[PDB]
Each structure stands twice: as structure tokens, then as C-alpha cells.
Amino acid sequence: NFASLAPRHGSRPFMGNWQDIGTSNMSGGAFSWGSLWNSSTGQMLRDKLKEQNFQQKVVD
Amino acid sequence: MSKEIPTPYMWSYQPQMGLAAGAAQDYSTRINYMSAGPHMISRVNGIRAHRNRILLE
Amino acid sequence: ASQLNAVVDLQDRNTELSYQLLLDSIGDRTRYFSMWNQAVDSYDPDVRII
């Protein structure tokens, strides 16, 4: 019916899961993809650069 | 142990000559049930009997 | 009642190291949990490698 106006992955309209429709509140509500004087100029730059990507559960 | 359900003997190969060397009872795969009651002990004995039937045949 | 033990321990097993590896595997390790004194040992990677 409405499959026409959907991105198509090839002769198969890419309609997502319907399970997903809105609940968050204050307890029991959590979502994935969670959070995470100069002496030695060694791994300091490495740690500064380390705050640029998490591969934790990269999904694609 | 028991003369009716015995732990099997496993052959040892000598690669070099091609004959079979001496064998021995299997000593690496024994089950330690020394901390079990009669139920599981009978179950394990039945299992070893099944294994022996498979081998003989 | 059953005057027989139910935990069998050999000298071969290393339960300390096994528990360490399990803790590493199931969850993150660098986090600190004071309940079990759960602090993992480490070095400054600048001290180890100059």
C-alpha cells in the first residue's frame, strides 16, 4: 500500500520493525550506545586522540 | 573396576614401525562421581555400560 | 544430612586465574568496584616503554 514511498534495497522495500514506538520515563528507561601540570608528553596525545570514536557496538 | 562394566583399554600406536605398542586403561577420561548419590551413580554406570556396548559391537 | 562433600577441588585447576579471565570477558575491566576490591593492576604505558 504505502511501500512505494520507502527506500528500496532491491525489489524489496525496506520497511523497518514496527515494534518501535516510544517509551522512556525515569526508572526502567535506558538506551543503548552508552557513555564512556605537564610532566610527560608521551601517551598524553594518544589519550587526547582516543576521545574520537567508540567502536563499542558499531552497527551497520 | 567391576568385572562386568570395565573401563576400556585404549591402544597406543607406534608410528615408526607400524605395529601397535602396548595399551592401557583409559586414564584421562574417567568421571569423578565420588561425590554423588546412588541415583547419579547408577546413571553413570549405565552410561559406561552403553559405551561398552558401542565399543564391542 | 548427607555426610558427603559436594565440592571437588584438584591441584591442577587455577580458579583465581579463571575468575580473573571471566571477569575480563563478561564485562568491562578498567572500571573500579570497591565491593570486591575489584581493581585491576597496570602500569603507565610510558613507564613500561620509554
Short mmCIF file of N, CA, C and O in Angstrom, two decimals, chain C residues 6-28:
data_model
loop_
_atom_site.label_atom_id
_atom_site.label_comp_id
_atom_site.label_asym_id
_atom_site.label_seq_id
_atom_site.Cartn_x
_atom_site.Cartn_y
_atom_site.Cartn_z
N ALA C 6 30.28 -32.08 48.45
CA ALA C 6 29.75 -31.81 47.12
C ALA C 6 30.55 -30.78 46.35
O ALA C 6 30.05 -30.25 45.36
N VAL C 7 31.77 -30.47 46.78
CA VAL C 7 32.69 -29.62 46.03
C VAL C 7 34.01 -30.36 45.94
O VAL C 7 34.64 -30.63 46.97
N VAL C 8 34.44 -30.66 44.72
CA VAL C 8 35.65 -31.44 44.48
C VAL C 8 36.68 -30.52 43.87
O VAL C 8 36.46 -29.95 42.79
N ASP C 9 37.82 -30.38 44.53
CA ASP C 9 38.86 -29.47 44.07
C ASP C 9 40.15 -30.24 43.84
O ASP C 9 40.60 -30.99 44.71
N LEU C 10 40.74 -30.06 42.67
CA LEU C 10 42.02 -30.67 42.35
C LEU C 10 43.13 -29.64 42.48
O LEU C 10 42.89 -28.44 42.61
N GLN C 11 44.37 -30.13 42.44
CA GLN C 11 45.50 -29.22 42.49
C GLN C 11 45.81 -28.63 41.12
O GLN C 11 46.54 -27.64 41.04
N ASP C 12 45.26 -29.20 40.05
CA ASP C 12 45.53 -28.71 38.71
C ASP C 12 44.80 -27.41 38.41
O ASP C 12 45.37 -26.52 37.77
N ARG C 13 43.55 -27.28 38.84
CA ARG C 13 42.77 -26.10 38.50
C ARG C 13 43.38 -24.85 39.11
O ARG C 13 44.06 -24.89 40.14
N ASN C 14 43.13 -23.73 38.45
CA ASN C 14 43.56 -22.42 38.93
C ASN C 14 42.33 -21.53 38.91
O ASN C 14 42.10 -20.80 37.95
N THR C 15 41.53 -21.59 39.97
CA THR C 15 40.27 -20.87 39.96
C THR C 15 40.47 -19.37 40.05
O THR C 15 39.64 -18.60 39.56
N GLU C 16 41.56 -18.92 40.68
CA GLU C 16 41.83 -17.49 40.75
C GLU C 16 41.99 -16.91 39.35
O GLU C 16 41.32 -15.94 38.98
N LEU C 17 42.87 -17.50 38.56
CA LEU C 17 43.10 -17.00 37.21
C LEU C 17 41.85 -17.15 36.35
O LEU C 17 41.55 -16.28 35.53
N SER C 18 41.12 -18.25 36.53
CA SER C 18 39.91 -18.44 35.75
C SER C 18 38.88 -17.37 36.07
O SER C 18 38.23 -16.84 35.17
N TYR C 19 38.72 -17.04 37.35
CA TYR C 19 37.79 -15.98 37.70
C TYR C 19 38.26 -14.64 37.16
O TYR C 19 37.44 -13.83 36.71
N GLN C 20 39.57 -14.39 37.18
CA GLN C 20 40.09 -13.17 36.59
C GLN C 20 39.70 -13.07 35.12
O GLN C 20 39.19 -12.04 34.67
N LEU C 21 39.93 -14.14 34.37
CA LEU C 21 39.62 -14.11 32.95
C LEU C 21 38.12 -13.97 32.72
O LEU C 21 37.70 -13.28 31.79
N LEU C 22 37.31 -14.61 33.55
CA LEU C 22 35.86 -14.48 33.40
C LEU C 22 35.42 -13.04 33.63
O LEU C 22 34.59 -12.50 32.88
N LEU C 23 35.95 -12.40 34.67
CA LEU C 23 35.63 -11.01 34.93
C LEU C 23 36.03 -10.14 33.76
O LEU C 23 35.31 -9.22 33.37
N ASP C 24 37.20 -10.42 33.18
CA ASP C 24 37.60 -9.68 31.99
C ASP C 24 36.63 -9.90 30.85
O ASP C 24 36.31 -8.96 30.11
N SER C 25 36.16 -11.13 30.68
CA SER C 25 35.37 -11.45 29.50
C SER C 25 33.96 -10.87 29.57
O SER C 25 33.53 -10.18 28.65
N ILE C 26 33.22 -11.15 30.64
CA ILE C 26 31.80 -10.85 30.63
C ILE C 26 31.56 -9.35 30.61
O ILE C 26 30.63 -8.86 29.95
N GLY C 27 32.38 -8.58 31.32
CA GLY C 27 32.15 -7.15 31.39
C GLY C 27 33.40 -6.34 31.16
O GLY C 27 34.46 -6.89 30.86
N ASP C 28 33.29 -5.02 31.27
CA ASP C 28 34.47 -4.18 31.20
C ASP C 28 35.35 -4.42 32.41
O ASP C 28 34.89 -4.81 33.48
#
